[PDB]
Amino acid sequence: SGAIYVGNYRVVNRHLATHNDWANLVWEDSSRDLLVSSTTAQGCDTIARCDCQTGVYYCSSRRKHYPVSFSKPSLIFVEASEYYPARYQSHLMLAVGHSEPGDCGGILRCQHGVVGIVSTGGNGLVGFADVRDLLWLDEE
Ligand SMILES: COc1cccc([C@@H]2CCOC[C@@H]2N)c1
Ligand SMILES: [Zn+2]
């Protein structure tokens, strides 16, 4: 589980979005596993605006933050899960590292701020949904 809180936006894994999120939906892309809902309070996360390929992600299933190299956001084939059929997830970054399903929402961060959230992985990989193209998260 986990979320990014930037301005009056909450960014979650689409597959973990709650009832209030949809009701309060701003934007969702099933192909990115992202959902942004509206918030009453102001968030204090900074979104990275960069092409960093190194960062640190939180792994709830190890209670540990791991330094990782990761691929640039790409269209990647992702095996079926309980939440999605087998399909090409867009804007997805892979690293070698431990993840289990429940680690989705863990932040990946570089020196510039939040890069993305754990979305997929397994067999020693972890996939992160990029949020760094979502320039509108920083305004309105
Ligand atoms: C971060 O998310 C993860 C991490 C590990 C495994 C999975 C699921 C396990 C079931 O088969 C589909 C996926 N590979 C997701
Ligand atoms: Zn960066």
Q: 51 and 28 in one domain?
A: no
129 close to 107: Cβ distance less than 8 angstroms = no
Question: Hey, whose CA ends up nearest to atom 1 of ligand 1?
Answer: 120
Cα 127 from Cα 99, distance rounded (Å): 9
The reply to whether 12 and 26 lie within a common domain is: yes
Same domain, 90 and 140: yes
The answer to whether the CB of 122 falls within 8 A of the CB of 114 is no
Residues 18 and 50 both lie in one domain: no
For residue 10, the enclosing domain spans 3-44
User: Going along the chain, which residue ranges are E strands?
Assistant: 4-13, 25-29, 34-44, 54-59, 64-69, 74-78, 87-96, 107-110, 113-122, 125-130
Statement to judge: residues 57 and 106 lie in one domain: yes
Q: Is 15 a catalytic residue?
A: yes
Residue 55 and residue 36 share a domain: no
Question: Do 52 and 37 share a structural domain?
Answer: no
Residue whose CA is closest, atom 15 of ligand 1? Answer: 101
In testing the pocket of ligand 1, which one of 62, 117, 120 has its CB within 8 Å of the most ligand atoms? 120
Is residue 104 among the annotated active site residues?
yes
Q: Coil, helix or strand for 115?
A: strand
From the CA of 81, which ligand is nearest?
1
